[PDB]
Design a protein around this ligand. Structure first.
Ligand SMILES: [Li+]
Ligand SMILES: [Li+]
Ligand SMILES: [Li+]
Length: 1214
RNA sequence: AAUUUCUACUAAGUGUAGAUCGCAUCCAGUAAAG
DNA sequence: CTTTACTGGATGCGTAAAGGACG
DNA sequence: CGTCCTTTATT
């Protein structure tokens, strides 16, 4: 009955649930006594190292094989590639060449002798030890000799490097899809602009960059591509384009450089080259690890014995004898830094430039010109071209008798005598005696003095940097610059320390670093099947509502095997979990084993058809031998006791299957069982005592005895895993992991609210302004203690029954929906998200801003304005970088805000059976508050698509539609690509064009171009109007237009409009940068100012009788204000009104503000609401198309509203 | 101002409401400084 | 442009049972 | 020769 009700059980998805895991009894003691966690903590860091060691071999294998390759009909792919016109024939003759090109690369890899042990224990046990030379590196590898299985994850990531398929991860994809097309695009460019490159240049590149082994033109010939397959070749090639530095410090100009300098000297339109991409797994000052590392490298780079301090005392001596060197020989560079050097020497920021302005005049000024606006624009040009200022050119700017060269020594010594003072306050840090009282990140007092020192020293050197002076100058006093540049180049070492100490000290004080636990099992907790309980040494227990993970110690693997009691009262329950995982692989695996293929002796008919693949779809498909293979499979399952008993199969008659999938889908659906058997609590509790078993309660706060009220969605999912009413909607999956997360704080540094003192409540609509508890409350308590983490993957809808193309199903239901609602969601600079809900006729049902999230529970309505919060935390991030206090996390404030939004949209969807209309989003961002909102919207999209993959209402009875077992699926599986289209399920992506600047009452939009241009053009504008008159009864000027008389107005449906001088508009400063215009009185001012009797009927003739351009310019400016329907001021959040120059059916102008005031407004309340509304309306229009197509044609309907269709729809539907 | 984790919270007190796909790998960008 | 963290999309696994060495 | 680590199957 609702459209939603169709979208349950449509496709499967996976999720991971996270839990704390609490040791029970003495298992944390036993774990500590057997020092298991130290062992797992080390294994993790060893693991990191061996992977890098393996990668070293992986890289070498890739490399030599890539050098080995010569690509066959590479050159012929290139010939067909560059063809401008290519047939539908040869468009796909080419695309098969792409496939075979890639196939060649992968076959080169998989053809190598070694490939076979690249991802098996032999690479650890055999290949790598022979490959490495370091005895330590080899020892590190050998320490995994019993443990190679743990690398099974890593090895899959590496097998993907060697695939043929069009995957981001594939080497072949990088080579052919990405790198080769760039090379041929480069080939295109290089043959056009080859003329530009002088004979000198090509050979300079050939000499220094290429070693003279290859000519520069070789790298743009087709048959050289093979050279650039390896990274060694990519590095030469991108050096040719970008240039590079040889080790003499000579910068070598690359061809892009010569292209860019040609583009300026010629002022031409050249395309430069794009650089090629990195090759998979080649490896192209790093951040501090420890806390006392920082104290040491602080002390050791900045103490009084440091190199950095020595130059400080050396720079002091040079400036103390500043009088002695030549004032013609020292220079002050001319930069944006120049006005602060001016205000230090003379007192005013503009003195230096103004005095230079004076003497430029002395030579270049004659009184005839007086001055001109570009002769002063040509004096501004030469000042930015002055590279430097001599210490004499500054003294000649000085009036008597201020000595600029002694004043500059006062300024510098004032800067070093303050550095020594910061060395007084910082001395006890420098002693070895000093011991760190607190965590460094928490401990702001010492951090402030490190920053106090680093800041004053950085403040010093960047001041004196101006004394290099771009030099570059013919007669420097190298007496001075000699010592200066040695000191300056040493003093500059501080900036790396500066950034590195800052980045460490302003991290989050708590950390989420964890390391994986194995319990001496390389395949620990791999799966849950009962058959493998001992193999994985992990299983799940439960006591009433409380669930436990129980782990067998490696010495007592069978310790849960033989336990029973008849009463579950005071006894645990063992999970009895059986899985047949992926029949398509496990049925051939078992029945064609060497262990069993004798026992079930398959027909020589059966082997022929399995090997030849006659049961699969394709040309060699034969249904009757596919029946026979299914028949074989059913009868051997019947004699494979391990399956036949666990699942009591009830297959279809084999003659009702159309394909092999039909039977597999039946096996997989039935091949899963979960139950509980009783297990004595006494004997289990003792295993835990003795250290034969380790028990952790699976826990989150919903499991606490103090919990009332709604559980986490994820708590529902976990519990439902074992509920009898869950008939496979959610399966419990394998591949769980258990981690250990060491504490990163201690309670003693934690912020606390102590017991019995009253705490303030933060919501002001709550009349209980205080809460007072009987215990301490601590910020971030969860990080003040070690914590075990359990990750449990689940499988939602593992056997979907409702298979259909979701997009086409949404079209059919929409077609036959008498009143389909639409949710239009819009972003504006003023409003984070704006929302309008329309019914199936475009009636506004709801419209409001989501800048504030409203929530009501227990009658307490709280509003949380995330717009304010998002900006406040934004500014907390600029304050922390300068004050060196911990990052304010704004990544997550967005996620927190989006979480609220997503719940609200899903409640609107359920309430209205509505589809969503989303704004297509622009590439650029303009302002720094406007980016954070573009990302907020872009993150809103990702999460909203996700929730709509399996959309659950926690309130519902869990097996109702919309319940946790029957979640809705109204968006398609993938988040982004490539199945992307204009539509994703219920979501339709809508372009924004004329959704904002459009009168919603009339559909009127502005298609006139009113920029002044010329007097000559301005007369046909005024003369294309049907009439321009004055209506005294309304104090308005009417401009009656037929858009057919103007250019590029096809889009508009209603050709004829009458425009009026109604109300007011807001003008922008061209150089309070806004003034408010009153339209009708400005028209009278203009016509009165120039003598144009405006009360005389049609006045188009008289306006063109004027020939003062001052008139026409001002007339065209007023015309632009009348048609500017959206008026507002940026920054001020007050006005966003939308006013129209066109009258409606009942003869009244549209004013957004007439509706902003109301609470049940039938028209938009401002330009943002107008956008959302019209975003929804374009989807309504789409739905109309759906209603005009027959069902069989629905999936071909164009939902892309044309601008000409939109205007017609908007101009007709009201 | 507590959390598997995140956001906003604290109505009678160790919690409330909503959100929450992990782990590994590869790769692009984009900001800053010399 | 080099050094480095932030965040972004893309690829794989989410397994029991055959297979084999090994003390 | 039972135990524990590796390798296998692919709608
Ligand atoms: Li809750
Ligand atoms: Li607080
Ligand atoms: Li409560």
């Amino acid at each position: 009955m609702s459209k939603l009700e169709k979208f349950t059980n449509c496709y499967s998805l996976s999720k991971t649930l996270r839990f704390k895991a609490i040791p029970v009894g003495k298992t944390q003691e036993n774990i500590d006594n057997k020092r298991l966690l130290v062992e797992d903590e080390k294994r993790a860091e060893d693991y990191k190292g061996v992977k890098k060691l393996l990668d070293r071999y992986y890289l070498s294998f890739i490399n030599d094989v890539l050098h080995s390759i010569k690509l066959k009909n590479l050159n012929n792919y290139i010939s067909l590639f560059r063809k401008k016109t290519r047939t539908e024939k040869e468009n796909k003759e080419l695309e098969n060449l792409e496939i075979n090109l890639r196939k060649e690369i992968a076959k080169a890899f998989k053809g190598n002798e070694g490939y076979k042990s690249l991802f098996k224990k032999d690479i650890i046990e055999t290949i790598l030890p022979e490959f490495l030379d370091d005895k330590d590196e080899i020892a590190l590898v050998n320490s995994f000799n019993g443990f190679t299985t743990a690398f099974t994850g890593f090895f899959d990531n590496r097998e993907n490097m060697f695939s043929e398929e069009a995957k981001s991860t594939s080497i072949a994809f990088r080579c052919i899809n990405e790198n080769l097309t760039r090379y041929i695009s480069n080939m295109d460019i290089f043959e056009k602009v080859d003329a530009i490159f002088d004979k000198h240049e090509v050979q300079e590149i050939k000499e220094k960059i290429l070693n003279s082994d290859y000519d520069v033109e070789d790298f743009f010939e087709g048959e050289f591509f093979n050279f650039v397959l390896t990274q060694e070749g990519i590095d030469v090639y991108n050096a040719i384009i970008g240039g590079f530095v040889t080790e003499s410090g000579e910068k070598i100009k690359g061809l892009n450089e010569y292209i860019n300098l040609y583009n300026q000297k010629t002022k031409q339109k050249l395309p430069k080259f794009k650089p090629l991409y990195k090759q998979v797994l080649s490896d192209r000052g790093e951040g501090y690890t420890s806390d006392e590392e920082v104290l040491e490298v602080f002390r050791n780079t900045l103490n009084k014995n440091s190199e950095i301090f020595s130059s400080i005392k050396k720079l002091e001596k040079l400036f103390k004898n500043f009088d002695e060197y030549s004032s013609a020989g020292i220079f002050v560079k001319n930069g944006p830094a120049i006005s602060t050097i001016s205000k230090d020497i003379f007192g005013e920021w503009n003195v230096i430039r103004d005095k230079w302005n004076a003497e430029y005049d002395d030579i270049h000024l004659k009184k005839k010109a007086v001055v001109t606006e570009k002769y002063e624009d040509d004096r501004r040009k030469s000042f930015k071209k002055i590279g430097s200022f001599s210490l004499e050119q500054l003294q000649e700017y000085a009036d008597a008798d201020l000595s600029v060269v002694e004043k500059l020594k006062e300024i510098i010594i004032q800067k070093v005598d303050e550095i020594y003072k910061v060395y007084g306050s910082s001395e006890k840090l420098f002693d070895a005696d000093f011991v760190l009282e607190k965590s460094l990140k928490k401990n702001d007092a010492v951090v402030a003095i490190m920053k106090d020192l680093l800041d004053s020293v950085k403040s010093f050197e960047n001041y004196i940097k101006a004394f290099f002076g771009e030099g570059k100058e013919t007669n420097r006093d190298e007496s001075f610059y000699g010592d200066f540049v040695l000191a300056y180049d040493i003093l500059l070492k501080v900036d790396h320390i500066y950034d590195a100490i800052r980045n460490y000290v302003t991290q989050k004080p708590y950390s989420k670093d964890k390391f994986k636990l194995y319990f001496q099992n390389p395949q620990f907790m791999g799966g849950w099947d009962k058959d493998k309980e001992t193999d994985y040494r992990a299983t799940i227990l439960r006591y009433g509502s409380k669930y436990y993970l129980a782990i067998m110690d490696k010495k007592y693997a069978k310790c849960l095997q033989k336990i029973d009691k008849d009463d579950v009262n005071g006894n645990y329950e063992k999970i009895n979990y059986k899985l047949l995982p992926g029949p398509n692989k496990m049925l051939p695996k078992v029945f064609f084993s060497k262990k069993w293929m004798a026992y079930y002796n398959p027909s020589e008919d059966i082997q022929k058809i399995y090997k030849n693949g006659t049961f699969k779809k394709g040309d060699m498909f034969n249904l009757n031998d596919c029946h026979k293979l299914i028949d074989f499979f059913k009868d051997s399952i019947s004699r494979y006791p391990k399956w036949s008993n666990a699942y009591d199969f009830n297959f279809s008659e084999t003659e009702k299957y159309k394909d092999i999938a039909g039977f597999y889908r039946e096996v997989e659906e039935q091949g899963y069982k979960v139950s509980f058997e009783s297990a004595s609590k006494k004997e289990v509790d003792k295993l835990v005592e003795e250290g034969k078993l380790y028990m952790f309660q699976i826990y989150n706060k919903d499991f606490s005895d103090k919990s009332h009220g709604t559980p986490n969605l994820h708590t529902m999912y976990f519990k439902l895993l074992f509920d009898e009413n869950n008939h496979g909607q959610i399966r419990l999956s394998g591949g769980a992991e258990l981690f250990m997360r060491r504490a990163s704080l201690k309670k003693e540094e934690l912020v606390v609210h102590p017991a019995n003192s009253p705490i303030a409540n933060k919501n002001p609509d709550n009349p209980k302004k205080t809460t007072t508890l009987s215990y301490d409350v601590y910020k971030d308590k969860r990080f003040s203690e070690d914590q075990y983490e359990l990750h449990i993957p689940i499988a939602i809808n593992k056997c979907p029954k409702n298979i259909f193309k979701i997009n086409t199903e949404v079209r059919v239901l929409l077609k036959h929906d008498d009143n389909p609602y639409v949710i239009g969601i819009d972003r504006g600079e003023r409003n984070l998200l704006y929302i309008v809900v329309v019914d199936g006729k475009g009636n506004i049902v709801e419209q409001y801003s989501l800048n504030e999230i409203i929530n009501n529970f227990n009658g307490i309505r709280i509003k949380t304005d995330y717009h304010s919060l998002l900006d406040k935390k934004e500014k907390e991030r600029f304050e922390a970088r300068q004050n060196w206090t911990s990052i304010e996390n704004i990544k997550e404030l967005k996620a927190g805000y989006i979480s609220q939004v997503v719940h609200k949209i899903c409640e609107l969807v359920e309430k209205y059976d509505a589809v969503i209309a989303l704004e297509d989003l622009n590439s650029g961002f303009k302002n720094s508050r406007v980016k954070v909102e573009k990302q907020v919207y872009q993150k809103f999209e990702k999460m909203l698509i996700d929730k709509l993959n399996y959309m659950v209402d926690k309130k519902s009875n869990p097996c109702a539609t919309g319940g946790a077992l029957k979640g809705y699926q109204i968006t398609n599986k993938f988040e982004s690509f490539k199945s992307m289209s204009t539509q994703n399920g219920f979501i339709f992506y809508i372009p924004a064009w004329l959704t904002s600047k459009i009168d919603p009452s009339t559909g009127f939009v502005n298609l006139l171009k009113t920029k002044y241009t010329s007097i000559a053009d301005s007369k046909k504008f005024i003369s294309s109007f049907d009439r321009i008159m004055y209506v005294p009864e309304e104090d308005l000027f009417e401009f009656a237009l037929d858009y057919k008389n103007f250019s590029r107005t096809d889009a508009d449906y209603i050709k004829k409009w009458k425009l009026y001088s109604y109300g007011n508009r807001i003008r922008i400063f061209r150089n309070f940068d806004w003034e408010e215009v009153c339209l009708t009185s400005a028209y009278k001012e203009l016509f009165n100012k120039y003598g144009i009797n405006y009360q005389q009927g049609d006045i188009r003739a008289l306006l063109c009788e004027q020939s003062d351009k001052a008139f026409y310019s001002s007339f065209m400016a007023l015309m632009s204000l009348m048609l500017q329907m959206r008026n507002s001021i940026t920054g001020r959040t007050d006005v966003d009104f939308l006013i129209s120059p066109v009258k409606n059916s009942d003869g009244i102008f549209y004013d957004s503000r007439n509706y902003e005031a109301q609470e049940n407004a039938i028209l938009p309340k401002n330009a943002d609401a107008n956008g959302a509304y019209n975003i929804a309306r374009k989807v309504l229009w789409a739905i109309g198309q759906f209603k005009k197509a027959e069902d069989e044609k629905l999936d071909k309907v164009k939902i892309a509203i044309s601008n000409k269709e939109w205007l017609e729809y908007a101009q007709t539907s009201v």
